[PDB]
Design a protein around this nucleic acid. Structure first.
Ligand SMILES: [Mg+2]
Length: 95
DNA sequence: GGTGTAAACATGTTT
DNA sequence: AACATGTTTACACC
């Protein structure tokens, strides 16, 4: 079965996991399948949602590659702690 | 209101 | 001329 984490959670967990807090798009792919074996099936479906979420939400901001050798994906510092307890189940509220 | 899924579309890198 | 990477629009679900 599918894990209960949203794609926003999946992408956030990947970014927070990188030692430099920056991650390749495909680094996000490898992170998810390594952690959640559900996603080794029918990649074309869910990997498109990953791409789609990165551009939609203003919380995932794309930063250019420091230099060559795609581009890195970061978290906007406002949404670094969307999830409060590190359970990644629900997002805590504000405003 | 924020999700999930599908699709069209537009650049960029790799056979 | 196959791919990967982003951007955006559209609809059902909760
Ligand atoms: Mg974005």
């Amino acid at each position: 079965p599918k894990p209960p984490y949203s794609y926003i959670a999946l992408i956030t967990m990947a970014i927070q996991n990188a030692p430099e807090k920056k991650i390749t798009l495909n680094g996000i792919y490898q992170f998810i399948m390594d952690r959640f074996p559900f996603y080794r099936e029918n990649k074309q479906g869910w990997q498109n949602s990953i791409r789609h979420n990165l551009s939609l939400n203003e919380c995932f901001v794309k930063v250019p590659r420091d230099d060559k050798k795609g581009s890195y994906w970061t978290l906007d510092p406002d949404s670094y702690n969307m999830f409060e307890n590190g359970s990644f189940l629900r997002r805590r509220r504000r405003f």
